[PDB]
Ligand binder design. Structure first.
Ligand SMILES: Cc1ncc(C[n+]2csc(CCOP(=O)(O)OP(=O)(O)O)c2C)c(N)n1
Ligand SMILES: Cc1ncc(C[n+]2csc(CCOP(=O)(O)OP(=O)(O)O)c2C)c(N)n1
Ligand SMILES: [Mg+2]
Lengths: 665, 664
């Protein structure tokens, strides 16, 4: 065809190919197969403004098949987003705006970081949830202030991953009809023909969840794809999967339809044969005709600027009609917590006892009253995790204004949805499960950390104290596994007051996820934690119980439920003439950020007798106790028995702490 | 009423009484599932309570692990080594009846469960092993390996992504000997299933390619028996039998409510329930002799007979195929063939190899010399170098193939590997990029807990991966596994270390081994060349000695950073600093050595210690102490040629030297 549409589509293909050739690295097959569908979505259906890529009401887009990144970068560049030709010529290079997989925060117009398969779809589900929640909270009368779609492109690999199955079940249950996923269905995986590992009916599975499924038989037919997208948008009650049958590496005589086109450059000669197949006559690489830029200018820039202008005008009128509502929305879009929200938070008195899951619950209910942007839930453990907002309604297909989310037994989808909710903007979000099952959502926590998303995890039942449910349900290594990960704050509060401070720090976060590690069992309120708690916990470690002498005989370090044990041990040590300091370390990461002077004041370099106590793996503790110190931890799995019995047998008693401290002196 | 109904109500009352006594546990599912489970156990399953490890028994996985009293009741009543006193010690310290089923702890328990989703996926792995072994060993009418794999699961299992992955895989492989009974009761832990779950499970399973059979009344054992018969008759598709039950059936006030899921019924409710069953036994934990006799006839005698017939056939088979039979006997016992290691490669000085490639060379050497080897990759065979080039693919058309194509299903691969190892007869491995070890982490955890000697081939271990960028570059993955109890983590420094590491992985009997391997070529190290197996077996060793008996500094490194450390040693010597270099391929193996050995490697008198590893610094202070330092990476990576990232992140001789001098 000689149409401008076909030329634009082939420009996307050749730009992707040429950038991959020049990098000598990347994935050309999918941009070649998927260019027509993506072009159709991008220029004929999506509402977006290249000049304002963070427009709050733009249609969102997730490239779940992140390896196809050049498809996205081509579209951004061609459309007038701030991705330049020189940027494309630096694909996969040090410090470029065009990294091998899409990275939120590094490239204008990229809505989510993808690459790990499956998560893109689950993240988009979260964005769609956020859109409906915000629309229900803020829209009034004729002011459809929040009103947009959520689009994704995925491939076969995405649909094999369990996290996409979870997310797709959840999305159908919530009737998220503004979620539309285009599935690049090309019968090919990295290792070879898809039929060597996969033969299910994706269409029937999705209908079984409750999705609308539309098939496009010829992926090069943009009229068919446009009809499908129009059909998807007219269905209001079901999320839609459009299965678009394409040829991977379309155009390549020798690589099309083969896994060879998936994951490395076509090569010099194959590239020429491919351009020949496209009737692409340009002799120079990275060629774009001005009329292609003009095509995108009319269909994307002009349309998106008009849409944004009309939205801005409406927002002005909305703000006149509903000043307080509009003001709350502006604050939420900007991630601002209401002045004084924290004055609402609880305080635990001396001589009181409370599990930190319960103080966490009390805090969640205090936040729900004072922070209108709060939105979250649990993976089918609301009662156990204590995450429920008792004065709020449930988020359901029938009431999107409800704040309580029922994720079901879907930890990984929850973790990814939370990222989508945070990416959308407007909401402060959290999700709960047992700490032991944090492992189920680990890859999504890793994406939150990389994307710098201030989500909050409520991880309860943090130790062998869990008791009867046994070793499959008792965390051991989970703390270390999170503490080692870049850009994740891990806070394990020692009592009710430390937990209030920990939640405060989680809610105030702007650039990193925060994992709150909480007990099933009641903890006593600590005298040393009671005053100035927020400032103490903010330091990460502090002296919870001072020694009598300026220079201690020994320093006891402990976290969470072990701080009370360490304090009891300090008392018993003092009877025997050993003068111990006790340090509560609710957060190693926050402590490490403190000044050398502060750290020296808590852990003086002159005191080398140091004993750490924590019901979790010993891994990582020698950073603080050193070669001459010691650690009472747990480096085996747990047991099935009443929790107090296990704790006793595993050595978490005053008598045992005292003995081990003396052996070390 | 019938002896069947009596036996069933006995299962129900024993479960309730044991949970009452423990004041802990989940009674609802035992109550609802007792009839279906009784039917399976006594009418279809072939098993010998007297010999619970019989190699050709039908395997059983209670995927809904919280219903554990259901299993303990059946085991006890059937004559397995689970006593009445054991039942009376449900959930107590040291008992044989822990809150969730624990393989290796309790006679007759085939798999540890509790983490939802994984039971089903583990069962898929057991089914794969059964067909692979059948294809390899059966000849003519000697069906030596010929049994079923059954599981019971609930709604929670079927919401988890891992069960979805595993079911897609099981249908693709046409595992018709896998039969899953789905206790479908409309309730999850937090209340009505319809608060979070409304999909058609039956239609989803049909879409995968499973046979699906509905039983409308979970109390109708004749209908349940018909469904299982129909399941067994269908040889090409795995079967899901959706059994519609009432959770906590029999309880006037808790039946059909989440209230019966996870707490004891309570004293008063237990009476009302027992009244509902027309159960008139005045004493707790009561079993009529006629119930024991029912199980003796339908389970013990049947299973004894089946095992004896199997023994007879095995003997006859061995006369016709002595080599095969000897091989099977050794494999069932986890024995590796005498001299199998003579076959392994050796890397000469002056040669270069990526450790993924040396791993692939070893994989192909093992395939030749160890007949029990069986494994694959999660759609990364080409990149992980896991493929056995002289072997066929494991498919629906040829179960004898050794190369498994797991597809993009890391978690199900991990759980399937556990099932393969549980079955017995096979040494198994699975590969993916190390960065995606995170996707199968909960299955690694169950391998460690169950003590299964599976092997993970984790390639592309660091920022050296390069252009694919930070989502594909491991940072914290080493620490995250090193911290886990009972997991061996080995990061070989060159081709020879990798050969030794594979040998240690294959020889394992009681813990999983993670092999951490490079995309990029590494040089062969002089100090690793001789006695490599014994050196790597120690976990850490001096790869390049200092000149003096007491070094000025110790450089510690692992994997790809050992060559850098040796280079740095050379540079330091020129400036009058005498360094010792220690290669630490495995922290866990070093930790297991004597204090005497450790002192020989990291003498306490040398406190100037500097560790180098392209990963998180977390954990290194165990070795470098408060006075030492570490050059690691505590941020995410970047998209660029791998050598550029390595330079920018400070992994150069010049920077190592600079920093070492700084702490002197
Ligand atoms: C969780 C995860 N596992 C494995 C991979 C490696 N990987 C990237 S693409 C792919 C298979 C190709 O998927 P598909 O989208 O079907 O390929 P296409 O036809 O789109 O090129 C694999 C195994 C990954 N990126 N993420
Ligand atoms: C991975 C994981 N997440 C969460 C849990 C906690 N949990 C156990 S059962 C359950 C609800 C599942 O209900 P189902 O298995 O259908 O119970 P039934 O009605 O069969 O008793 C939850 C959230 C778990 N065991 N594993
Ligand atoms: Mg594909």
């Amino acid at each position: 065809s000689h149409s401008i549409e076909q030329l634009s589509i082939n420009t996307i293909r050749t730009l992707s190919i040429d950038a991959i050739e020049k990098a000598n690295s990347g994935h050309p097959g999918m941009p070649m197969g998927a260019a027509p569908m993506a072009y159709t979505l991008w220029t004929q259906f999506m509402k977006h403004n290249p000049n304002n890529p963070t427009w709050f009401n733009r249609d969102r887009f997730v490239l779940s098949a992140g390896h196809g990144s050049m498809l996205l970068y081509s579209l951004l560049h061609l459309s007038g987003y701030d991705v330049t030709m020189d940027d494309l010529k630096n694909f996969r290079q040090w410090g470029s705006k065009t990294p091998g997989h899409p990275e939120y925060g590094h490239t204008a117009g990229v809505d989510a970081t993808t690459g790990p398969l499956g998560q893109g779809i689950a993240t988009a589900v979260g964005m769609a949830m956020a859109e409906r929640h915000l629309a229900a909270k803020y829209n009034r009368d004729a002011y459809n202030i929040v009103d947009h779609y959520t689009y994704a492109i995925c491939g076969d690999g995405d649909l094999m991953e369990g996290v996409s199955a979870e997310a797709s079940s959840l999305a159908a249950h919530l009737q998220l009809g503004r979620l539309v996923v285009l599935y690049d269905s090309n019968d090919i995986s990295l290792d070879g023909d898809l039929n060597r590992s996969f033969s299910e009916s994706v269409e029937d599975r999705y209908k079984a969840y409750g999705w609308q499924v539309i098939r496009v038989e010829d992926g090069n037919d943009i009229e068919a794809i446009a009809k499908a997208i129009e059909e998807a948008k007219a269905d209001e009650k079901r999320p839609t999967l459009i299965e678009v049958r394409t040829t991977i590496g379309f155009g390549s005589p020798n690589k099309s339809g083969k896994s060879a086109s998936h994951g490395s450059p076509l090569g010099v000669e194959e590239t020429k044969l491919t351009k020949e197949a496209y009737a692409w006559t340009a002799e120079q690489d990275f060629h774009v005709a001005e009329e292609v830029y003009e095509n995108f200018r009319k269909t994307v820039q002009d349309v998106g600027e008009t849409a944004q202008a009309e939205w801005n005008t409406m927002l002005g009128e909305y703000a006149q009609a509903y000043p307080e509502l509009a003001n709350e929305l502006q604050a939420a879009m900007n991630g601002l917590l209401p002045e004084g929200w924290e004055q609402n938070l609880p305080t635990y008195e001396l001589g009181s006892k409370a599990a930190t899951r319960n103080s966490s619950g009390a805090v969640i209910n205090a936040i729900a009253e004072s922070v209108p942007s709060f939105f979250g839930g649990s993976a089918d453990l609301a009662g156990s995790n204590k995450t429920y907002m008792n004065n709020e309604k449930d988020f359901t297909r029938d009431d999107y204004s409800g704040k309580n989310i029922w994720y079901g037994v879907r930890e990984f989808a929850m973790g990814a949805a939370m990222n989508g909710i945070a990416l959308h903007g407007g909401l402060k979000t959290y999700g709960g499960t047992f700490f032991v099952f944090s492992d189920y959502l680990r890859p999504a926590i890793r994406l939150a950390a990389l994307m710098q998303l201030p989500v909050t995890y409520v991880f309860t039942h943090d130790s062998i104290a869990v008791g009867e449910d046994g070793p499959t349900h008792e965390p051991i290594e989970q703390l270390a596994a999170l503490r080692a990960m870049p850009n994740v704050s891990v806070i394990r509060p020692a009592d009710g007051n430390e937990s209030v401070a920990a939640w405060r720090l989680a809610l105030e976060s702007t650039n990193k996820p925060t994992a709150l590690v909480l007990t099933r069992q009641d903890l006593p309120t600590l005298e040393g934690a009671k005053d100035d708690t927020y400032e103490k916990v903010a330091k990460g470690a502090y002296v919870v119980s001072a020694s009598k002498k300026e220079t201690a005989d020994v320093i006891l370090l402990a976290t969470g439920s072990e701080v009370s044990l360490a304090v009891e041990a300090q008392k018993a040590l003092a009877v025997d003439g050993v003068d111990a300091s006790v340090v509560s370390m609710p957060s190693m990461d926050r402590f490490e950020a403190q000044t050398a002077e502060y750290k020296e004041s808590v852990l003086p370099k002159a005191v080398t007798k140091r004993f750490a106590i924590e019901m979790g793996a010993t891994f990582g503790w020698h950073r603080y106790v050193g070669l001459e110190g010691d650690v009472l931890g747990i480096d085996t799995f747990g047991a099935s028995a009443p929790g107090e019995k296990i704790m006793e047998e595993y050595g978490f008693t005053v008598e045992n702490v005292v003995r081990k401290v003396k052996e070390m002196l």
